[PDB]
DNA sequence: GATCATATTGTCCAGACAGT
DNA sequence: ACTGTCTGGACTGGTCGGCGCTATGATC
RNA sequence: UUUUUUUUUUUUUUUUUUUUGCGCCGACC
């Protein structure tokens, strides 16, 4: 297609040289994804204060990234020494990396606030005295394998990443601010159903795909496990390569499971806009899904190299940051409160033409982990909302008495010397349970160790890596105070099977948080097998148990369960332990929460689309909203296109 | 189908059982070997009854144990195609009902229980009919005919059994008596 | 004259043909014509009255190995000179292999064939869901022919 | 394939299996561990006890009179008839339809009239 | 780079076409044909296929794309 | 200045074999 | 049927330690 | 003033525990 990126770049350069003083020495101006990069020979005059950069960003309506000229670059050892001397010793810098190709130094520090500065003046001071553009990322207190691998992949593929970013920036700004003639919303999946979500945003200029996911419940049937690839609009977009970007709401298999499949068969080549916690958690979940599919004997959906390609094609966006991802579409992300890095996708199509907010999975009540979902937007016309708990009789129990019952059950179990086994998801409810247990044990209620097995430790490390995405209480504790709730010594990690055997054989009371809520794999099955005959122990279920799983069999009240032994003979598990079920820790919004979010959203949307739930639940939610507030509501099926404007 | 077979086999008896009775040691070894697995030719191996005859030991190089030719009786249960069985429902599932007919549990599909559009009731784990208004619950005398046998693996639990109840004469004992009342 | 074969290094037939042509022009070799099809790898066709002229022309070049001791009938290389589309000769329903493109080393089934745009639509056989893709005709290679 | 070779095989009814499983349960109880047998043997014993329609001696005598009654039947379907214990024509018809023979109603009535005795 | 004419199928290194003076040249072509004698057999075969080819000895292309 | 296809085709003893 | 000729093959076991050797030319 | 088309209900989770080879040279018994 025809592009006018060169004319836009020339106009931007003319505006810059009109505004920026001549002593700066501007050499090259280019686009790197959704941000503008300016190369100068005198960084001292360019950024003596933040007012000039702020004025340039306000005038150009772009994210300005000032970088020094590659010709004026200090030696890496002298640059490292100068950076270490300039940064205060309170901020413990761990790793410093340099990019010879483009002026940029990556600084890994335990306290990025001191490296950045009170108002960013420390970054300007560093890039002035050292002539190296600084990029600061947080070193987690708990080491994370996924984050280290992602950072190593990004650093080792700098040339490919820069080429991809330049191509994305050229494609995004192919033309200036364009008013779309029409806006179309089509659902390739997740409409009147749970899982395999897929939302396509179509205009006359650009196309946007939102939370491309997969279905695990119907994995046996290919017609229901994956989004509708037979849609004529999706086929036209993929065949012609017109997909501008893909945005993932949050890191779950029903929202990001099908992402590596596109890169496996080279069906996509553009960028992916997720928050860094969402990217890390979705990479971990995709790797676990691939490993599980491999272990089950079925053909894996994709390969780890496809996940690496997804990592290489991912652009990280923070909360509240407005970026241009299309000639007519502006994308910003807001907190959702469901899981770590969960974002509500807000799309600003045109210059005030229309606004779409896709909430996805979200929570509107305050929690121990994350702040409630953002209900305030600069402009809102169409709202897309989940309907997982959209039924009239769907009313989840409040959090405080559920956690009180959990605490009292755990205390009763530990009073008699038993062991508490809590099967849980890899992300979500497990971290909330750990936070509740840490709060209870901080007053001296319990002294027994808490053991995390499987992906719980990795998810905890990822949570520690991004404390700004957590709730206000945890943020205040970590930043204002010196206390980190996740760094409690009670939380212990078991390395191998020998440590698990020692934990099981030990007579001292302990709390074990496994990584399989249904007891279908992982260390949860072994823990249940080795702790079931003991009557002093107890098992607490914090999630719904699907039919046909071992966890549902234990929850229903089966005293004995026949299983296949190691030698090939049937084995009988005597479940003499206590069984408890507390389903009050669900991260999904309640029906009352959904109604409150509809009532308290500002501004009031013109129409509301109910998706991500069962068909009768979605219809009930839409009818209730229409009857209570008078807003027009629709619950379309799959392959349904709605013309918003 | 319960079966009784007389099997002649070579039994390896370790030196730790040298002081015991040869017949008792052979029976213990045979119980450790054959009991608890599925045989492709004979079906589920239930138990080893007794050892009839035992021969003198033979010592082979590389092993100190003695090998004896033993004759023993085996009780086995084998499911065959198109075989009518009588059992009791022990497990209820949304996709079907599991009936205990012996060492293995068969599966009857939701369309297969009766000539009616039966739906599952989750609250009580029962099947409720639409026109016949018949209810199936725990501990019910039922009769079905096997239509599917899987011998893919030697593990009893991994093997699957599928039975039918569409045909006349297959169902609950009360239902059978109701059918016989008309005739 | 007579068609002769010269064995050259694979992937560098055009440069060897150009060097032979330049040498023949400069030194007045009795060479009639040189044909170097792109589909044929490592071999070029030189038209000369006798094989001695070909041997004298190709010597002194590191990349010209030897001349095949035989004469090719013109009917064998007649089809090379004719211009035909790469899409033509392909029917839907068979299995093809994609030599080049983003789908290198992948087997696919032909779905739609159009000779107007010189493009062929294929469906990957290893994909769990059918996703038709448009690829150039010359990029594919016919593995089997069924329907 | 159990063992090296099979000498003889016999089809037994539910009651004989119940007696054998009771003997094996007694033998396992005589053993030091509290578990007499595995899950499948215990389940089979429970099913045979809950479906103990006739005594083992009654099952054997019914089997031998069934063998001496008609010639086209074999041991397997004789044991099947002993276990089922039919009382009318529909059940014997639906269990003989899939067999190799389709007996006329007179011999089915004769079978009913001989197996009517010593029944619960 | 070397580009071939769409009319006479002639490969030239300059914008001007020394055969027909065409301004539309294609940078993608395969099966390079070198013609040294006009009366060559392959030149005659190319003449009946493409009328404008083999008029002047030199480089030639079988197809233009 | 970085990468990519291609990279060549020692005497003596015994058994089998043309020659006369 | 003899007689000189062509061709294939195997070349005593073990042990000690050292000393090299395992890409290159042509675009982009 | 006019021919030759048909029509309807039963398969569940958003996921899991240690340099090979090649050849050369010297040497011991
Ligand atoms: Zn979801
Ligand atoms: Zn021309």
Curated annotation (Swiss-Prot), chain A:
Family annotation (SUPFAM superfamilies): Metallo-hydrolase/oxidoreductase, Prokaryotic type KH domain (KH-domain type II)
Region of interest called KHa, as start-end residue ranges on this chain: 6-73
Annotated stretches, region: KHb: 74-141
Cofactor binding note: Binds 2 Zn(2+) ions, which are required for nuclease activity.
GO MF terms, alphabetically ordered: DNA binding; exonuclease activity; metal ion binding; RNA binding; RNA endonuclease activity
Known cofactor(s): Zn(2+)
SMART domains assigned: Beta-Casp, KH, Lactamase_B
Known EC number: 3.1.-.-
Regulation of catalytic or functional activity: Transcription termination is stimulated by the Spt4-Spt5 complex. Dipicolinic acid inhibits FttA-mediated termination in vitro and inhibits growth in vivo.
Keywords: DNA-binding, Endonuclease, Exonuclease, Hydrolase, Metal-binding, Nuclease, RNA-binding, Transcription, Transcription regulation, Transcription termination, Zinc
Chain residue ranges for the region called Beta-Casp: 393-586
CDD domains (alphabetical): KH-II_CPSF_arch_rpt1, KH-II_CPSF_arch_rpt2, TTHA0252-CPSF-like_MBL-fold
InterPro entries reported in the protein's UniProt record: aCPSF1, Beta_Casp, KH_dom, KH_dom-like_a/b, KH_sf_prok-type, MBL, Metallo-B-lactamas, RibonucZ/Hydroxyglut_hydro
Region annotated Metallo-beta-lactamase C-terminus, chain positions: 587-645
Annotated region (Metallo-beta-lactamase N-terminus), positions in chain: 182-392
The keyword Acetylation is annotated on this UniProt entry: no
Any GO BP: DNA-templated transcription termination
Record-listed Zn(2+) 1 binding positions: 250, 252, 338, 361
Entry binding sites for Zn(2+) 2: 254-255, 361, 612
Disruption phenotype: Essential, it cannot be deleted, and enzymatically impaired strains of FttA could not be generated. In depletion experiments transcript 3'-UTRs become longer, suggesting transcription termination is altered in vivo.
Domain of life from the UniProt record: Archaea
Job of this protein: Terminates transcription on the whole genome. Termination is linked to FttA-mediated RNA cleavage and does not require NTP hydrolysis. Cleaves endonucleolytically at the RNA exit channel of RNA polymerase (RNAP); the 5'-3' exonuclease activity of this protein degrades the nascent RNA released from RNAP.
The family this protein is said to belong to: Belongs to the metallo-beta-lactamase superfamily. RNA-metabolizing metallo-beta-lactamase-like family. FttA subfamily.
Protein name, per record: Transcription termination factor FttA
From Swiss-Prot, chain C:
Disulfide bonds: none
Annotated GO biological process: DNA-templated transcription termination; regulation of DNA-templated transcription elongation; regulation of transcription by RNA polymerase II; transcription elongation-coupled chromatin remodeling
Any one GO cellular component localisation term in the record: chromosome
Chief place where the protein resides: cytoplasm
Disruption phenotype: Essential, it cannot be deleted.
Highest taxon of the lineage: Archaea
Domain KOW: 92-123
Any one GO molecular function term: translation elongation factor activity
Subcellular location: Chromosome
Keyword vocabulary terms for this entry: Chromosome, Transcription, Transcription regulation, Transcription termination
CDD domains: KOW_NusG (cd06091), NGN_Arch (cd09887)
Family matches, as Gene3D superfamilies: 2.30.30.30, NusG, N-terminal domain
Keyword field contains Transcription regulation: yes
Family to which the UniProt record says this protein belongs: Belongs to the archaeal Spt5 family.
Biological function: The Stp4-Spt5 complex stimulates transcription elongation on both naked DNA and histone-bound DNA (chromatin), facilitating transcription through the histone barrier. Neither protein functions alone. The complex also stimulates the transcription termination activity of FttA, neither protein alone nor the KOW domain of Spt5 stimulates FttA-dependent termination.
NCBIfam families referenced in this protein's UniProt entry, alphabetically: KOW_elon_Spt5 (TIGR00405)
Subunit structure: Heterodimer composed of Spt4 and Spt5. Interacts with RNA polymerase (RNAP). The complex interacts with FttA.
Designated name of the protein: Transcription elongation factor Spt5
Species whose genome carries this gene: Thermococcus kodakarensis (strain ATCC BAA-918 / JCM 12380 / KOD1) (Pyrococcus kodakaraensis (strain KOD1))
UniProtKB/Swiss-Prot annotation, chain E:
Predominant location category: cytoplasm
Gene3D superfamilies: 2.20.28.90
Keywords: Chromosome, DNA-directed RNA polymerase, Metal-binding, Transcription, Transcription regulation, Zinc
One term of GO molecular function: zinc ion binding
Outcome of gene disruption: Essential, it cannot be deleted.
Pfam families attached to this UniProt entry: Spt4
Record has Kinase as a keyword: no
Gene Ontology BP terms: regulation of DNA-templated transcription
A cellular-component GO term for this protein: DNA-directed RNA polymerase complex
Subcellular location: Chromosome
Residues annotated as binding Zn(2+): 5, 8, 17, 20
Domain of life: Archaea
Intrachain disulfide bonds: none
Entry's family note: Belongs to the archaeal Spt4 family.
Subunit and partners: Heterodimer composed of Spt4 and Spt5. Interacts with RNA polymerase (RNAP). The complex interacts with FttA.
Its biological purpose: The Stp4-Spt5 complex stimulates transcription elongation on both naked DNA and histone-bound DNA (chromatin), facilitating transcription through the histone barrier. Neither protein functions alone. The complex also stimulates the transcription termination activity of FttA, neither protein alone stimulates FttA-dependent termination.
UniProt name for this protein: Transcription elongation factor Spt4
Originating species: Thermococcus kodakarensis (strain ATCC BAA-918 / JCM 12380 / KOD1)
């Amino acid at each position: 297609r025809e592009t006018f990126v060169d004319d836009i770049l020339k106009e931007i350069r003319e505006i810059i040289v009109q505004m920026v003083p001549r002593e700066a020495g501007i050499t090259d101006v280019e686009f790197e994804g959704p941000e503008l990069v300016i190369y100068v020979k005198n960084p001292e005059a360019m950024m003596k204060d933040g007012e000039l950069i702020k004025n340039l960003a306000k005038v150009l309506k772009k994210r300005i990234s000032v970088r020094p000229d590659p010709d004026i670059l200090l030696p890496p050892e002298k640059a490292e020494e100068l950076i270490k001397q300039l940064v205060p010793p309170e901020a413990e810098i761990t790793n410093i990396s340099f990019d010879p190709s483009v002026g940029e130094v990556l600084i890994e520090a335990r306290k990025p606030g001191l490296v950045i500065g009170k108002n960013g003046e420390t970054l300007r001071l560093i890039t002035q005295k050292v002539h190296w553009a600084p990029r600061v990322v947080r070193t987690p207190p708990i080491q994370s394998q996924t984050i280290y691998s992602i950072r190593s992949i990004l650093q080792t593929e700098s040339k490919d990443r820069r080429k991809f970013l330049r191509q994305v920036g050229r494609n995004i700004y192919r033309k200036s601010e364009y008013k779309s003639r029409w806006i179309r919303i089509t659902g390739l999946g997740g409409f009147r159903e749970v899982g395999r979500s897929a939302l396509l945003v179509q205009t006359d200029e650009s196309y946007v795909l939102v939370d491309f996911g997969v279905n695990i419940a119907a994995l046996k049937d290919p017609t229901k496990a994956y989004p509708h690839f037979d849609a004529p609009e999706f086929r036209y977009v993929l065949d012609e390569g017109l997909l501008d970007a893909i945005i993932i709401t949050h890191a779950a298999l029903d929202h990001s499971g099908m992402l590596p499949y596109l890169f496996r068969y080279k069906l996509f080549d553009g960028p992916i806009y997720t928050t860094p916690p969402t990217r890390d958690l979705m990479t971990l979940l995709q790797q676990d899904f691939i490993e599980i599919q491999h272990m089950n004997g079925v053909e894996p959906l994709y390969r780890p190299k496809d996940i690496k390609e997804v990592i290489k094609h991912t652009i990280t966006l923070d909360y509240g940051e407005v970026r241009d991802i299309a000639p007519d579409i502006r994308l910003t992300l807001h907190n959702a409160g469901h899981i770590l890095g969960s974002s509500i996708v807000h799309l600003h199509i045109g210059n005030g033409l229309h606004n779409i907010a896709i909430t996805g999975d979200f929570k509107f009540i305050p929690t121990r982990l994350f702040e409630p979902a953002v209900s305030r937007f600069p402009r809102l016309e169409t709202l897309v909302m989940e309907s997982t708990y959209g039924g009239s009789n769907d009313y989840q129990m409040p959090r405080e008495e559920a956690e009180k019952r959990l605490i009292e059950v755990i205390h009763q179990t530990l009073k008699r010397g038993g062991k508490v086994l809590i099967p849980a998801m890899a992300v979500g409810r497990a971290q909330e349970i750990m936070m509740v247990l840490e709060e209870y044990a901080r007053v001296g209620g319990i002294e027994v160790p808490i053991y995390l097995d499987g992906m719980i430790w990795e998810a905890t490390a990822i949570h520690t890596a991004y404390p700004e995405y957590l709730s206000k209480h945890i943020r205040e504790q970590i930043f204002h105070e010196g206390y980190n709730p996740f760094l409690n010594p009670i939380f212990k990690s078991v390395a191998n099977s020998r440590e698990r055997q020692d934990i099981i054989d030990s007579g001292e009371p302990a709390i074990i948080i496994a990584t399989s809520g249904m007891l279908v794999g992982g260390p949860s099955v072994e823990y249940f097998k080795q702790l079931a005959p003991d009557p002093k122990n107890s098992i607490i279920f914090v999630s719904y148990q699907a039919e046909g799983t071992l966890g549902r069999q234990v929850q229903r009240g089966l005293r004995e369960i026949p299983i296949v032994g190691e030698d090939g003979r049937t084995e009988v598990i005597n479940v003499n332990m206590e069984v408890h079920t507390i389903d009050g820790f669900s991260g999904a919004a309640d029906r009352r929460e959904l109604m409150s979010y509809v009532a308290r959203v500002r501004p009031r949307p013109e129409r509301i689309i109910t998706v991500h739930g069962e068909a009768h639940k979605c219809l009930d939610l839409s009818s209730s909203i229409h009857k209570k507030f008078g807003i027009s509501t629709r619950a379309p099926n799959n392959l349904d296109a709605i013309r918003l404007k | 189908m319960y079966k009784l077979l007389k099997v002649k086999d070579v039994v390896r008896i370790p030196p730790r059982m040298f002081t015991m009775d040869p017949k008792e040691a052979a029976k213990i070894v045979l119980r450790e070997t054959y009991e608890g697995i599925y045989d492709r030719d004979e079906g589920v191996v239930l138990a080893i009854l007794d050892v009839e005859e035992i021969s003198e030991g033979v010592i082979v190089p590389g092993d100190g144990a003695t090998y004896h030719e033993a004759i023993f009786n085996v009780l086995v249960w084998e499911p065959r195609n198109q075989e009518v069985v009588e059992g009791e429902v022990v497990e209820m599932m949304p996709y079907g009902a599991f009936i205990r007919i012996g060492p293995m549990d068969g599966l009857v599909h939701i369309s297969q229980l009766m000539d009616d559009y039966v739906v599952f009731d989750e609250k009580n784990r029962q099947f409720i009919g639409k026109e016949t208004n018949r209810v199936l619950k725990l501990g019910d005398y039922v009769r079905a005919r096997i239509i599917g046998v899987s011998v893919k693996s030697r593990v009893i639990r991994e093997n699957k059994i599928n039975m039918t109840m569409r045909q006349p004469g297959l169902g609950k004992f009360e239902w059978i008596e109701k059918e016989k009342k008309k005739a | 004259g007579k068609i002769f074969t010269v064995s050259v290094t694979v992937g560098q037939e055009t440069t060897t043909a150009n060097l032979i042509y330049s040498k023949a022009k400069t030194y007045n070799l009795p060479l009639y014509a040189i044909l170097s099809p792109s589909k044929v790898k490592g071999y070029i066709f030189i038209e000369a009255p006798n094989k001695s002229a070909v041997e004298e022309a190709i010597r002194g070049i590191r990349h010209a190995k030897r001349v095949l001791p035989g004469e090719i009938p013109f009917s064998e290389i007649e089809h090379f000179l004719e211009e035909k589309p790469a899409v033509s000769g392909f029917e839907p329903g068979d299995i093809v292999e994609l030599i080049a493109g983003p789908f290198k080393g992948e087997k696919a089934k032909v779905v739609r064939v159009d000779e107007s745009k010189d493009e062929i639509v294929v469906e990957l056989v290893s994909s769990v869901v059918p996703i038709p893709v448009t690829v150039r005709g010359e990029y594919v290679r016919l593995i089997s022919k069924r329907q | 394939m159990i063992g090296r070779k099979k000498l003889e095989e016999h089809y037994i009814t539910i009651a004989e299996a119940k007696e054998l499983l009771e003997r094996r349960h007694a033998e396992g109880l005589a053993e030091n561990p509290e578990e007499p047998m595995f899950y499948e043997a215990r389940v089979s014993l429970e099913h045979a006890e809950r479906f103990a329609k006739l005594k083992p001696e009654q099952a054997r005598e019914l089997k031998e009179k069934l063998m001496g009654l008609f010639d086209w039947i074999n041991e397997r379907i004789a044991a099947k008839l002993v276990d089922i214990l039919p009382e009318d024509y529909l059940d014997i018809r639906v269990i003989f339809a899939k067999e190799e023979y389709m007996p006329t109603p007179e011999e089915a009535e004769e079978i009913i009239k001989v197996i009517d005795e010593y029944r619960p | 780079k070397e580009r071939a004419c769409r009319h006479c199928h002639y490969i030239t290194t300059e914008d001007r076409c020394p055969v027909c003076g065409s301004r539309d040249l294609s940078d993608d072509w395969f099966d390079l044909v070198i013609v040294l004698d006009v009366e060559s057999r392959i030149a005659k075969k190319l003449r009946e296929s493409i009328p404008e080819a083999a008029k002047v000895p030199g480089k030639y292309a079988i197809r233009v794309r």
